[PDB]
Design a protein that fits this description.
This protein has no helices and 10 strands. The protein has strands at 9-10, 18-19, 24-31, 37-42, 48-51, 56-57, 65-68, 71-76, 81-85, 88-93. A 7-stranded antiparallel sheet has the order 1-2-3-10-9-8-4, with no helix packed on it. This is Nisin immunity protein.
């Protein structure tokens, strides 16, 4: 008997966002080095494409668009959470942190 794992709910067909532990959360532009990562957190497979033109979701991959993979969550040494995106781990913060922090940027890809 061992209970310790919650399924992450992604917005789907939308920008970077998700809810964990009944709490709103999103992917930030802040990236954390593997050396800071403690270990795996959650295993999921999600991929989508967004156009940098209007920052909207699409159905195909164009030159004016960039693919984004929101998944592969990991833990940090400071109990911080992060998600894997394009071989790059980006820290995740609650939507309540808005005002001073914003979602990640596709320019990093």
């Amino acid at each position: 008997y061992q209970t310790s794992h919650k399924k992450v709910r992604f917005d789907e067909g939308s920008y970077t966002n998700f809810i964990y532990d009944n709490k709103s959360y999103f992917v930030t532009d802040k990236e954390i080095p593997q050396e800071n990562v403690n270990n795996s957190k959650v295993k999921f497979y999600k991929l989508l494409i967004v156009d940098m033109k209007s920052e909207k979701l699409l159905s195909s991959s164009n030159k004016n668009s960039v693919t984004l993979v929101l998944n592969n969550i990991y833990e940090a040494s400071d109990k911080s959470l992060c998600m894997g995106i394009n071989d790059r781990y980006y820290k995740i913060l609650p939507e309540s942190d808005k005002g001073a922090v914003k979602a990640l940027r596709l320019q990093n890809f």
